[PDB]
Amino acid sequence: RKESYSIYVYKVLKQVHPDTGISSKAMGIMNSFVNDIFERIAGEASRLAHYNKRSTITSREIQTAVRLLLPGELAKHAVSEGTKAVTKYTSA
Amino acid sequence: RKESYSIYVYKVLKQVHPDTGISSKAMGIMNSFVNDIFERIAGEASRLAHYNKRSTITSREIQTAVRLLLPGELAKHAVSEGTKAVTKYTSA
Amino acid sequence: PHRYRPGTVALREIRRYQKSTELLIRKLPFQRLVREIAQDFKTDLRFQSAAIGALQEASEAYLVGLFEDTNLCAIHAKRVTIMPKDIQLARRIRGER
Amino acid sequence: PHRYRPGTVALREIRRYQKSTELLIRKLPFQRLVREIAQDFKTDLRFQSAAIGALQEASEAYLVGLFEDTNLCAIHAKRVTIMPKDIQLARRIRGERA
Amino acid sequence: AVSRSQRAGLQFPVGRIHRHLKSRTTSHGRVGATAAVYSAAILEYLTAEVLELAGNASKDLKVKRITPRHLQLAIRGDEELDSLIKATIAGGGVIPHIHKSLIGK
Amino acid sequence: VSRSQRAGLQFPVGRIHRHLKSRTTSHGRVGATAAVYSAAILEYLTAEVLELAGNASKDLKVKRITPRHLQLAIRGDEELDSLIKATIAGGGVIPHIHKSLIGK
Amino acid sequence: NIQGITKPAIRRLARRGGVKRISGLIYEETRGVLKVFLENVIRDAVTYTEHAKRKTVTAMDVVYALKRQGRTLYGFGG
Amino acid sequence: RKVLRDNIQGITKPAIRRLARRGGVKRISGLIYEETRGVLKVFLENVIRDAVTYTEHAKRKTVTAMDVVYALKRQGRTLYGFGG
DNA sequence: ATCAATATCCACCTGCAGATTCTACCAAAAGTGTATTTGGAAACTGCTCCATCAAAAGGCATGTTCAGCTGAATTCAGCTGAACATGCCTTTTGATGGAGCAGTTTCCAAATACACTTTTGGTAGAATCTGCAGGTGGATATTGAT
DNA sequence: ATCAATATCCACCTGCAGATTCTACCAAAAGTGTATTTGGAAACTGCTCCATCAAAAGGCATGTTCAGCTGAATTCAGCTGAACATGCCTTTTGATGGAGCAGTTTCCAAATACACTTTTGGTAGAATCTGCAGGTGGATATTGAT
């Protein structure tokens, strides 16, 4: 009944570190973490669209929101991944 | 075209200080103050609604938001004024 | 007979406690305190153990971080001993005032 | 010939400036500083005059507020002269970076 | 024909504030009839509190018109407004203060 | 045929869209790719934290990442540290002792 | 009750904080501060509790309260 | 145009002394003036970078006072008196 | 830096149990396919307001000199806070069983959203009042030499 | 103590810049209808809390001793504040052209909105296993003392 990002955090753990496990208290941290960045990114994106008298939060809002929220370098790569995932997904 | 809170700030001014004017820069400040506090209330109130899986923002949300944002004495008095106006309004 | 010099054990405890991560306030006295404070706001309250545990975590994280900034103010004054004026200055520059 | 003792004019100036509200940095050089920094981010930018007005008010608000904290750190060290290490202690505790 | 502001005994505009609540939240978001009223009420009360103290300040300086300096004096001088309003008032200056150590022995 | 798999992501694009839709606004709408983009950067960031956190645990020859390892990873990295000024429950602090406090 | 936050405990907290030597007056100072801390957080937590018409302060009510004082905590539901 | 450089030195020693005076500072060490310039520059970079990010997003070439007011709110240095 | 004798700390290896991970089914999303809406990018365009330029003039920045007094260095001794091994009161913990009461769920009255067609309040410039910004000139400190 | 030298008031004064009023369309607030939910409102679970008891086991409180640190007092090199002369560069007044906001319009590519089909992720019990926390004993760090 109560959803979580546990499943997906563990999946990501197994790519960068197939060897490694994660304790449940640590998994709690990653959860709080993913919820927090999600809510920051989401908040800034809504704000952006409102400042510009728009209504649809597009990936353009998200991207700018990332430039505003993430320290450069974390932001560079985060812009890559998103641009990647998006082009690859619009290829049918 | 561009709305403002000026004629209302001015009305309230005449009530407390019938003799006193307000330079336009001071009114600019007052406008920023009203829009600010409005955003904090509305923000806190929408978040309150979210934490309780409710989709409507009622006077009951606003009242909690005010208890959370306003310190001590300002809160007691703002709650009385809000309660008073609501029960006056709900008298058809 | 054996004694360590003033400061030697102190530095040992710094090293030990900066190494560990357990709560350093005792659970029960802390629970007593949280409940007493809460009673002044709403009566016959009940607390999730998770909520008491969050409060303690936040509290100790807060105090430990405040002791870091207090030490900096003490060192600023060519001391080695923190004093309440060190806590006062830190809280002032922090805006907790 | 008449000389005020070291520090007397200084207290006059605190009283003067704490009483006034005008900007204390000259406008033109500050406008220049803003356009220099802005340009090292994106070429061919313009500025509404109120945008530079906003930056200057915030900038002086920030600096005045930081000298208050800086001053508390100097006094805490039982000094009367603010120094770079005071500004550094202020900013460390403020959570600002460095 | 009467306005909702009037119906609540308020100067602040209830309709407009009801219309900004709809505008900003949530998605599937609903705003009650009395959420707007309650909001106009506390916006108006706070405006009154600030203008009450600001006005006193400018009477203490024998001038008729409130300026940002007066707003700043009022807010910094009131323990609770000072805590509520951690914003920068353009044009405001600061509250005159000189630490004792600095005053010439 | 799911949108996460289409975008080449581990993170749940569908769910992220349903959450975004619930953020803004009455009026509000949410682009197709916005959900994808968001999910993309949430995944990247947790990979970055788990990467470093993994190293911290290997450098202690343990298999399971704990909150200590997340704390050491995050505080020991300039940018993650800037980004995350949250409190990591049970992570403790980075060992550090001021020069002036060491014995002579 | 505040006195139940004992001196060796305050000692331990300071040690984690890098403190070598502690003035004898720090202990009463530290409790006053910890007390202002908990009062500010709990008041907000209880306000979230009452809003939800509950008699039980949940961990989420504290996590939300901490987020409002700008003391975000990871590990307890957000 | 003309090349812009060394404009931080346009924040003169007397301007910094005046700002310190409003901040209640009585005596100033000679090394304060270059510290202050350094700190002002980091302040302005951060605010202008964010402001310009708002400009670029909205596809404008002109930084508005709204861009600056939003940038400051992000940095937790909320400003009143320009906001419309 | 060696002599000694503490104690501390640091590997290496060890054994269970508290947590983790792997296994097996049921609903609420997540994905499809259709049918509308619609918001926001076009493509013109009216028209602020932003970048320049010019030009005159005094409000200030710059640079130097001179020495007052502040910060930094040094010495000292009173006494505050660290270390210690003692003695006991409080926290820890771990089931038990009762129970308060979060969290469901099922049900409809009130409260909300729409929606076409009213009426009015407030914004944008014109039109008039008028505070107050500093200009000036002497009475009241305030400061610093003697 | 007194002057002497400046700085600071504090009140009075007059048209200018900026404020308070005055006047017209447009968006928006209002009163009608009808159609849809929302989230109390009751009534009953099961969690999961509080309140027990009851050891043994810590971890705290207590008092003594003195190392060593903080604060006070003293000295002095020289950094920094005050004042002055000089003149540049900011300010201010006012134009010019036009770049580029921002106000209208059309109108597809992109969304919401169903209604069904099909999948996955959450829960609750199985099935190992990481590593806590315990042992040893080797080397280290600390402190007294030819």
Numbering used by the authors:
A (entry chain H), B (entry chain D): 33 to 124
C (entry chain A): 38 to 134
D (entry chain E): 38 to 135
E (entry chain C): 16 to 120
F (entry chain G): 17 to 120
G (entry chain B): 25 to 102
H (entry chain F): 19 to 102
Give verbatim excerpts from the published study on this entry.
As the H2A.Z nucleosome with a histone H3 variant, H3.3, at a TSS reportedly has different physical properties from the H2A.Z nucleosome with the canoncal H3.1, we also tested whether the incorporation of H3.3 affects the structure of the H2A.Z molecule in nucleosomes. To do so, we crystallized the homotypic H2A.Z and heterotypic H2A.Z/H2A nucleosomes with H3.3 instead of H3.1, and determined their structures at 2.93 Å and 2.35 Å, respectively. We then found that the H3.3 incorporation minimally affected the H2A.Z L1 loop structures in both the homotypic H2A.Z and heterotypic H2A.Z/H2A nucleosomes. The stability of the homotypic H2A.Z nucleosome with H3.3 was the same as that with H3.1. Therefore, we concluded that the H3.3 incorporation does not directly affect the structure and stability of the H2A.Z nucleosome. The diffraction dataset of the homotypic H2A.Z nucleosomes with H3.3 was collected with an X-ray wavelength of 1.0 Å at −173°C on the BL41XU beamline at SPring-8. The Ramachandran plot of the homotypic H2A.Z nucleosome with H3.3 showed 95.8% of the residues in the favoured region, 4.2% of the residues in the allowed region and no outlying residues.
In the nucleosome, two copies each of histones H2A, H2B, H3 and H4 form the histone octamer, which wraps about 150 base-pairs of DNA on its surface. Among the histone variants, H2A.Z is known as a universal nucleosome component and has been suggested to function as a regulator of transcription. H2A.Z is known to accumulate around transcription start sites (TSSs), which frequently contain nucleosome-depleted regions (NDRs), especially in transcriptionally active genes. Intriguingly, in mouse trophoblast stem cells, the H2A.Z nucleosomes around TSS regions convert from homotypic (H2A.Z/H2A.Z) to heterotypic (H2A.Z/H2A) after DNA replication.
